[PDB]
Amino acid sequence: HDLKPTPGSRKDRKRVGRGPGGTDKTAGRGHKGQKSRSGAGKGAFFEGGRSRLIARLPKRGFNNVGTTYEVVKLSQLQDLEDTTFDRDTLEAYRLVRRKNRPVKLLASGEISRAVTVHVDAASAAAIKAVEAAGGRVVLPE
Amino acid sequence: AQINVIGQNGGRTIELPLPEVNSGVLHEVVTWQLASRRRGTASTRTRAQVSKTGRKMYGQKGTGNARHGDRSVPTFVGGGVAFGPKPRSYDYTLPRQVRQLGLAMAIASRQEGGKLVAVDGFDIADAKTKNFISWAKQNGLDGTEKVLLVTDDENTRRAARNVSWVSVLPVAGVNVYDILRHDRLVIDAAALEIVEE
Amino acid sequence: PKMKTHKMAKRRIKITGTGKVMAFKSGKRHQNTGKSGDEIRGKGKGFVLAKAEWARMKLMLPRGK
Amino acid sequence: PSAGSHHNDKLHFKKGDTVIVLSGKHKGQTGKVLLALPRDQKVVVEGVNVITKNVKPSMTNPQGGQEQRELALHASKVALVDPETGKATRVRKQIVDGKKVRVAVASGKT
Amino acid sequence: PRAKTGIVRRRRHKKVLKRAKGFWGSRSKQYRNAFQTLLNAATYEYRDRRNKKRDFRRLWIQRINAGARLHGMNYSTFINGLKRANIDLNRKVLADIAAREPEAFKALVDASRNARQ
RNA sequence: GUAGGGGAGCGUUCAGUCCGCGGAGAAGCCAUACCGGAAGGAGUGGUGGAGCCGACUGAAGUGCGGAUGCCGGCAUGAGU
RNA sequence: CGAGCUGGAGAUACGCUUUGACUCGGGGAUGUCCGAAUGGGGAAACCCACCUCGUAAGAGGUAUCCGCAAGGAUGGGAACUCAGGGAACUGAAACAUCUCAGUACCUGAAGGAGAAGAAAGAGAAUUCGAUUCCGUUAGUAGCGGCGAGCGAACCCGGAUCAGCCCAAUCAAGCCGAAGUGGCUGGAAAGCUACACCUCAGAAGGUGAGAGUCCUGUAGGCGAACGAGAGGUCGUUGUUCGUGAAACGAUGACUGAAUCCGCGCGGACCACCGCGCAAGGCUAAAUACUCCCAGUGACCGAUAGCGCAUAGUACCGUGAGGGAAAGGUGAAAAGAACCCCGGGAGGGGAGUGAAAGAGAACCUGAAACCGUGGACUUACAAGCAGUCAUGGCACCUUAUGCGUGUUAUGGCGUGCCUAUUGAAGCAUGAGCCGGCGACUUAGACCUGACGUGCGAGCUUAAGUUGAAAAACGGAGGCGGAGC
Ligand SMILES: [Mg+2]
Ligand SMILES: [Mg+2]
Ligand SMILES: [Mg+2]
Ligand SMILES: [Mg+2]
Ligand SMILES: [Mg+2]
Ligand SMILES: [Mg+2]
Ligand SMILES: [Mg+2]
Ligand SMILES: [Mg+2]
Ligand SMILES: [Mg+2]
Ligand SMILES: [Mg+2]
Ligand SMILES: [Mg+2]
Ligand SMILES: [Mg+2]
Ligand SMILES: [Mg+2]
Ligand SMILES: [Mg+2]
Ligand SMILES: [Mg+2]
Ligand SMILES: [Mg+2]
Ligand SMILES: [Mg+2]
Ligand SMILES: [Mg+2]
Ligand SMILES: [Mg+2]
Ligand SMILES: [Mg+2]
Ligand SMILES: [Mg+2]
Ligand SMILES: [Mg+2]
Ligand SMILES: [Mg+2]
Ligand SMILES: [Mg+2]
Ligand SMILES: [Mg+2]
Ligand SMILES: [Mg+2]
Ligand SMILES: [Mg+2]
Ligand SMILES: [Mg+2]
Ligand SMILES: [Mg+2]
Ligand SMILES: [Mg+2]
Ligand SMILES: [Mg+2]
Ligand SMILES: [Mg+2]
Ligand SMILES: [Mg+2]
């Protein structure tokens, strides 16, 4: 019973109606309207009576899923990672986690100390700037 | 950093939750814990339920009376409740992190108390209560506080059970509640420095 | 329950970085032989809406795609 | 809701037995058991006393009349006795014979 | 858990009905008419606070006018010659002087007139 | 100052916990000229007969003059 | 079990039982008539029979279908499950495809569950490996007057595991520790001075609150009996609305190969993969809850089921609808007896602590009706108040800022809702009680406050323990845009 709650960490709700204090009558709702009505459904994309922007517009293209590539960054194999190398499960037990996708390595930062990579694919400038700083890139067969 | 009782005398480990213990995270974990264990049970009926058949009762216009449809209605005596409680469950999963930090902060709050008694032994003969009362008496347990046991020895509990001024928490099942719920923690000692690590 | 994505919109509106929503320009099926040249060219494209009529779109999809 | 309900309709004593009133006005008095009603958990000790008026009832007796007889009681101010002490006197159950069961105190028996 | 009015309403209500006494018929006895009567009563209280501040001022005034005229002075002329000789008296007091204190009012008169001409 | 958004709070129950009262009398009810800025809350007196106030915290079937609202009681019309 | 019993029921008289009753557990025997009714009929509970044995009194049999017989079926069951049949209101702000929804309802069958099930499968890894269930993938892939809206599965984590065969311990009960003295009180359990028990401080009863009176609990025992193929045409199913329509699925027409063979991989073709149709059963996890038990930030008499009990009273030709109902006391000690009256009712008495509990029996609010008293009121015009003064009265938050009442004055258009505008001759309402309306759900969306970890944050289903919680990385959010 000692304790107490963090100042502002629990706000007391609104119970609308109840007095002129107070939220008299109406309950926020004003006077009449379709809004006034105890009834579901309005909803949120229902502009006017009308026809919507939503359906007034060109349907371009379609929808392909595709293979989407998991980001690996330079400044993350770099800086103070002190090359424990990429291996396989190693980068997983660090900071690049998904499954059921292939990993990609691309630029962003700068390059120094020599490292060999173990990725499923990579950008041209990436293999470029990592070989030119002392290390390979293992692309599968 | 605090002393034991019947075996060793170590206790200098166990780091603690400063600035100077927090009331907020406590109250959080407590009220949470209290919630998690409620029976979720207050059922009432609505119109669909109140055995009060659909049938239009009388004339939609004509009678000189206010208009009604059914007798199963919120404005009727007898009828169903409007906005009543139903069976639910006020439980959630408070994130690990703060369970640990609470628990801790409780222990602590009672160490700088200092209502801790770190215990390495227990001399309570064979499972008898009077022996508990005696041992107790000689560790500093006047009789004017609520005391919470945590050990692992069936005998000591069986001794610590009927005691009006004491509660008996077995092994791990320990919580910010019970502890703050009380005046004293029977620490014990065994799973304290090793539960540190 | 889980707020449905408006498949009405899965080929006609786009999110971004800043959060802004884009869509295309309109008039490219019988608004043709008109023409004019910079019209027909202008309309194949794409563009960000104003504001006011933004949030709606957003609420049409949760994933942003 | 019955009175022996919470008392497993159980009469700890018996018709005959001497008794002493624990709590009440009749604190401590002796009485043979004249009537022991287990379910209602009610019972008559020769102590109690009461003055009852049995109304007109022409037959028998034209006029009414009255009567000094005694109001029954609740087996929970009834107490069995200890021949030695004779007071507030619990009971243990032991075995004399020979599959005959009996009843001591802290110094048997009764 | 459910929570009947139980008690609260009787409380509120009595509060009103205890404000509500001396009132003629139903007003003093039924809640609705009572509370109601009191809405209007509210209006009358507020306004009539400032109002009485007016009314009294009026009263003092007519008494002074009297006073002046009791010799040969107008109210306006008396009070004006009592602004002129700077005799900065409240008029409530002036009424008091005027009706409870004769020869004093006499002098204040002679003064005002002097300062007037 | 109307619709409206914002701010601080009053009361009701159930609940955790502490202060604690009660057959030399609990709650509830009844009277009143005390207190608080207001929701409200205290003092004492009469009622009653066995339970309850206060602080902090939590959760709500949480505050009614209206709905020709619902249940119940009692008035008018009428000694007609 | 061991002393009382003779049902609620509260009444007399009759009795019964320590040779063991009454109550309890466990079997048996007897069980009229109706009802699947079933010997035939019938307007259910009634009518009339025929046959076998009996001395009669009686007893049995006499439906229909599957069967050689023996034997099984009929009818009922709140929901739960499967199947044949299958609505509409509604939404799309109109409607018709569509959505409501294979929902409501009807029906058939069946069980304590059921269904489903042992791959011509998912499928895309040349991986998994019967089903049902939950988590998740996932509002993703897709469906759609591409509108409203509709919405998977594989993988990944759990629950529980099974695969077999054929045709050439609880249910009655017993036993269980430890306090007395004084005090208030009508009454001790409370106050108090000293006590003892605890594997027992859960609870309930006892004249007011009992660890140590009682029944119990922790614990310990515990029974004779007792329970454990293809194709075509019209269609449809899955996210499947004729769309490129695969596949299954059947109504009508057609009815191929059987191993160098058959089926699928979403038109279709080769290739290359996964597979063995035409035969059956299958526990387990899962669903429900009439019923039994345990609990409760569920209700306590307008609540809670409709019912403190009743589907009754009452309404209805019927289907069907369908109430309000609670409290003397600690114990009947239930008021002998005198008084006015035919009575009803009351006034004593007497009991009790209290009859300020007396059977219209706990409190006893308000509207509403009255008796008495104060101050007032019969030349007066009124939303009934206000505010100022005088009169009279009173003195337990109370002799001054008084309180009650009043006369005279000034002043003054009930409330609510609806409105450009309400005293409105515009809506509502006899009065007072009590019931009466902005909520809940989702691990959805987006924000404000807060918090814990912080380039890191987090579990869900479940598992184990459970007077507590911990485990659980499967997935989720952040990480890079176009
Ligand atoms: Mg507000
Ligand atoms: Mg309105
Ligand atoms: Mg309007
Ligand atoms: Mg009318
Ligand atoms: Mg002025
Ligand atoms: Mg409380
Ligand atoms: Mg209460
Ligand atoms: Mg009303
Ligand atoms: Mg009318
Ligand atoms: Mg007449
Ligand atoms: Mg008339
Ligand atoms: Mg007449
Ligand atoms: Mg018995
Ligand atoms: Mg017979
Ligand atoms: Mg027949
Ligand atoms: Mg229609
Ligand atoms: Mg429509
Ligand atoms: Mg059937
Ligand atoms: Mg076809
Ligand atoms: Mg179809
Ligand atoms: Mg096919
Ligand atoms: Mg009541
Ligand atoms: Mg009811
Ligand atoms: Mg009489
Ligand atoms: Mg009078
Ligand atoms: Mg006149
Ligand atoms: Mg007159
Ligand atoms: Mg209103
Ligand atoms: Mg108008
Ligand atoms: Mg009028
Ligand atoms: Mg009107
Ligand atoms: Mg109108
Ligand atoms: Mg935040």
The full set of domains in chain C, from first to last, is 1-65 (4.10.410.60)
Of residues 107 to 126 in chain B, which lie within 7 A of strand G by their beta carbon? none
User: Hey, what are E2's tokens?
Assistant: 């459910």
CATH number for the domain harbouring residue B26: 3.40.1370.10
- Cα separation, E100 vs E93, in Å, equals 10
According to DSSP, residue D35 is labeled E
Q: How many domains does chain E have?
A: 1
Domains in chain D (CATH in brackets) are 1-110 (2.30.30.30)
Chain A CB within 8 Å of residue C55 CB = no
CA distance A81 to B17: 31
Q: Given CB atoms, is B27 within the 8 Å cutoff of chain A?
A: yes
User: How many domains does chain B divide into?
Assistant: 1
Measured in Å, residue E84 CA sits from the centre of ligand 30 at: 57
Cβ pair B28:A6 closer than 8 A: yes
Partnered with residue A137 across adjacent β-strands are A117
Q: Which residues of A touch C45 (CB under 8 A)?
A: none
Residues in chain E closer than 8 A to B85 (CB atoms): 1
Give the side-chain half-sphere CA count within 13 A for D11.
18
Q: CA–CA separation, B10 vs B2, rounded Å?
A: 7
Per the structure, the complete domain to which residue E105 belongs is given by 1-117
Which amino acid type is present at position B125?
Answer: A
Q: How far is Cα C53 from Cα C23, in angstroms, rounded to an integer?
A: 12
Domain that holds residue B124: 1-197
Token output for B153: 């020895």
Token pair, residue B72, equals: 């199963």
> B42 at the E interface (CB within 8 A)?
yes
Instruction: For residues B151 and B135, give the distance between their C-alpha atoms in angstroms, rounded to a whole number.
Output: 15
Distance CA C24, CA C13 (A): 8
Report the run of H or E that residue D30 belongs to, with start and end: strand D30-37
Three-state SS at D20: strand
Gap from CA of B64 to ligand 4 centroid (Å): 6
CA–CA distance, B170 with B189 (Å, rounded to integer): 13
Q: Counting Cβ atoms within 10 Å, is residue D7 exposed (0-12), middle (13-18) or buried (19+)?
A: middle
**Bases on strand F under 7 Å from any protein CB:** 2-9, 11-18, 28-33, 39-41, 55-71
Q: How far is CA D76 from CA A58, B71, D5, D103, in A?
A: 92, 52, 14, 18
